[PDB]
């Protein structure tokens, strides 16, 4: 991102420490639901309690 | 006569029955000094009646 | 009644106090009486719904 | 009229004489006269009585302060004339980059007042920003181009003595709103460019009008906040004594006062039937 400073503009960078940070235009909301279903399937909790 | 005006109000205007008067009803005794100030609106008895009703309503309120 | 009312025409409602002139003016047209609590926009929208 | 509970006659007449002599004295703010505020009589009379006293004093003060009503239309007209003159000077003058000057002149050259108390301050703020940026561009002094960091309102090329005098005059304006006086800045004609002379006169006028209107608004805000807090505290205190006269007093006080005319209506109704509910307040 570009950021504001006193009478100045500067560039800023930061680490996307969780995958959730990706914009939902590139990683849509339903994609996380299906991936969570896949996590539960791998752990054999597919029908949750 | 001040008593003449008081009787005029409490008889012609409010039409309150004789057995209830200023000596017995305290809030009416306090209110009636204000009412004689208003020379007009004597044609509308219902307005005065409903004003006295809402005044005795707050007089015995709980909140 | 006829002309869009200016704020001066708006009268203040008097709950719980002796206000017999407004009682005599119930059948009157112009001196509109309004409650003190104006409706906020969210409650406005909910009531409209 | 203003009348209140329990105090001796001399104190009451002194306070009411204080209210009418508000215009001539300096430092019009009520906080600047703490003796009047303490004259309400804390520790002398019962707490509910002194709350009623203070609410009455504040409400009468608001009535007087609103009534004085600094309707400075003459200064408004003079500022409009100066704005037209500055627009003409902007038209006649040359520049190194004409487009920006034309844009700021276009935002300048139509700023007639919309006959509302609130709108004049913001529109004069915008017009003054445009005038200052135009003057600085005319001198070819540097101007803050940083985004959002808009050019501040300030004089240009005026001597330190004159700006000190002007700042002291504006501080006095802040001290007393009702009867401020204009000035001619003792501006020279031999030195400096004429467009800067015109814009300096204009910016002085704009600073004066902004300061006086802002001070009046600040006093109104403070008075409304204090009266609302006093009313809230008083109704909370009196709520415990459930009785007809006390409940009538509560029903009077329950009205909001956020708009000044509503506060004036509350004053009118509170005066109109004072004898009805006086018994709730214990004297001495």
From Swiss-Prot, chain B:
Keyword Amino-acid biosynthesis found: no
A single GO cellular-component term on record: viral capsid
Function text: Participates in the assembly of the infectious particles by decorating the outer surface of the capsid shell and thus forming a layer between the capsid and the tegument. Complexes composed of the major capsid protein and small capsomere-interacting protein/SCP assemble together in the host cytoplasm and are translocated to the nucleus, where they accumulate and participate in capsid assembly.
Lineage: Viruses, Duplodnaviria, Heunggongvirae, Peploviricota, Herviviricetes
Protein name: Small capsomere-interacting protein
Recorded family membership: Belongs to the herpesviridae small capsomere-interacting protein family.
Subunit comment: Interacts with the major capsid protein/MCP.
Location in the cell: Virion; Host nucleus
Gene this chain is encoded by: SCP
Primary site of residence: virion
GO BP term, example: viral process
UniProt keyword annotations, A-Z: Capsid protein, Host nucleus, Virion
Residues of the whole record sequence present: 13 to 75 of 75
Keyword Kinase tagged: no
Curated annotation (Swiss-Prot), chain C:
Subcellular location: Virion; Host nucleus
Function summary: Self-assembles to form an icosahedral capsid with a T=16 symmetry, about 200 nm in diameter, and consisting of 150 hexons and 12 pentons (total of 162 capsomers). Hexons form the edges and faces of the capsid and are each composed of six MCP molecules. In contrast, one penton is found at each of the 12 vertices. Eleven of the pentons are MCP pentamers, while the last vertex is occupied by the portal complex.
Subunit relationships: Homomultimer. Makes the hexons and eleven out of twelve pentons. Interacts with triplex proteins 1/TRX1 and 2/TRX2; adjacent capsomers are linked together in groups of three by triplexes, heterotrimeric complexes composed of one molecule of TRX1 and two molecules of TRX2. Interacts with scaffold protein; this interaction allows efficient MCP transport to the host nucleus. Interacts with capsid vertex component 2/CVC2. Interacts with the small capsomere-interacting protein/SCP.
Family assignment from sequence similarity: Belongs to the herpesviridae major capsid protein family.
Protein name: Major capsid protein
Organism, scientific name: Human cytomegalovirus (strain AD169) (HHV-5)
Portion of the parent chain present: 735 to 783 of 1370
Swiss-Prot record, chain D:
PTM comment, free text: Phosphorylated by host CCNA2.
Subcellular location: Virion tegument; Host cytoplasm; Host nucleus
Domain of life: Viruses
Residue ranges that the Swiss-Prot or TrEMBL entry lists as coiled coil: none
Assembly mode: Interacts with host BICD1 and RAB6A. Interacts with small capsid protein UL48A; this interaction links together the capsid and pp150. Interacts with host CCNA2.
Functional note: Participates in the last steps of viral maturation and release. Associates with nuclear capsids prior to DNA encapsidation and later preserves the integrity of nucleocapsids through secondary envelopment at the assembly compartment. Interacts with host CCNA2 and thereby blocks the onset of lytic gene expression to promote establishment of a quiescent state of infection in undifferentiated cells.
Family: Belongs to the herpesviridae large structural phosphoprotein family.
Identification of the protein by name: Large structural phosphoprotein
Classification lineage: Viruses, Duplodnaviria, Heunggongvirae, Peploviricota, Herviviricetes
UniProt gene name: UL32
Residues of the full protein shown: 2 to 285 of 1048
């Amino acid at each position: 991102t570009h950021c504001q400073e006193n009478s100045e503009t500067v560039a800023l960078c930061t680490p996307r420490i969780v995958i959730g940070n990706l914009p939902d235009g590139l990683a849509p909301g339903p994609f996380h639901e299906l991936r969570t279903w896949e996590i539960m399937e791998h752990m054999r909790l597919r029908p949750p309690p | 006569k001040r008593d003449e005006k008081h009787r005029h109000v409490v008889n012609v205007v409010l039409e309150l029955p004789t057995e209830i008067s200023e000596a017995t009803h305290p809030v009416l005794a306090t209110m009636l000094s204000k009412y004689t100030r208003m020379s007009s609106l004597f044609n509308d008895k219902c307005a005065f009646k409903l004003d006295l009703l809402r005044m005795v309503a707050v007089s015995r309120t709980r909140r | 009644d006829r002309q869009p009312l200016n704020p001066a025409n708006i009268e203040a409602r008097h709950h719980g106090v002796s206000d017999v002139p407004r009682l005599g003016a119930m059948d009157a047209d112009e001196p509109l009486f309004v409650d003190d609590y104006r409706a906020t926009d969210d409650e406005w929208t909910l009531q409209k719904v | 009229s203003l009348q209140f509970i329990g105090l001796q006659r001399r104190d009451v007449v002194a306070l009411v004489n204080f209210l009418r002599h508000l215009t001539q004295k300096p430092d019009v703010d009520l906080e600047a006269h703490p003796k009047i505020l303490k004259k309400c009589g804390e520790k002398r009379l019962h707490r509910r009585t002194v709350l009623f006293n203070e609410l009455m004093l504040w409400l009468g003060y608001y009535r007087e302060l609103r009534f004085h009503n600094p309707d400075l239309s003459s200064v408004l007209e003079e500022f409009e004339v100066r704005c037209v003159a500055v627009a003409r000077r902007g038209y006649t003058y040359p520049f190194g980059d004409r487009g920006k000057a034309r844009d700021h002149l276009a935002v300048l050259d139509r700023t007639e007042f919309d006959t509302d108390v609130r709108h004049d301050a913001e529109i004069v703020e915008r017009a003054l920003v445009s005038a200052v940026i135009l003057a600085k561009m005319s001198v070819r002094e540097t101007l803050v181009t940083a985004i959002g960091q808009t050019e501040p309102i300030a004089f240009v090329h005026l001597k330190d003595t004159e700006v000190q005098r002007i700042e002291e005059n504006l501080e006095g304006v802040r001290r007393n709103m009702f009867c401020v006086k204009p000035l001619d800045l003792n501006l020279d004609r031999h030195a400096n460019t004429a467009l800067v002379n015109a814009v300096n006169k204009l910016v002085y006028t704009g600073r004066l009008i902004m300061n006086v209107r802002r001070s009046w608004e600040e006093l109104e805000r403070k008075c409304l906040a204090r009266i609302q807090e006093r009313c809230k505290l008083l109704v909370k205190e009196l709520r415990m004594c459930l009785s007809f006269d006390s409940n009538y007093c509560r029903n009077i006080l329950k009205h909001a006062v956020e708009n000044g005319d509503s506060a004036d209506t509350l004053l009118e109704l509170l005066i109109e039937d004072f004898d009805i509910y006086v018994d709730s307040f214990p004297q001495s």
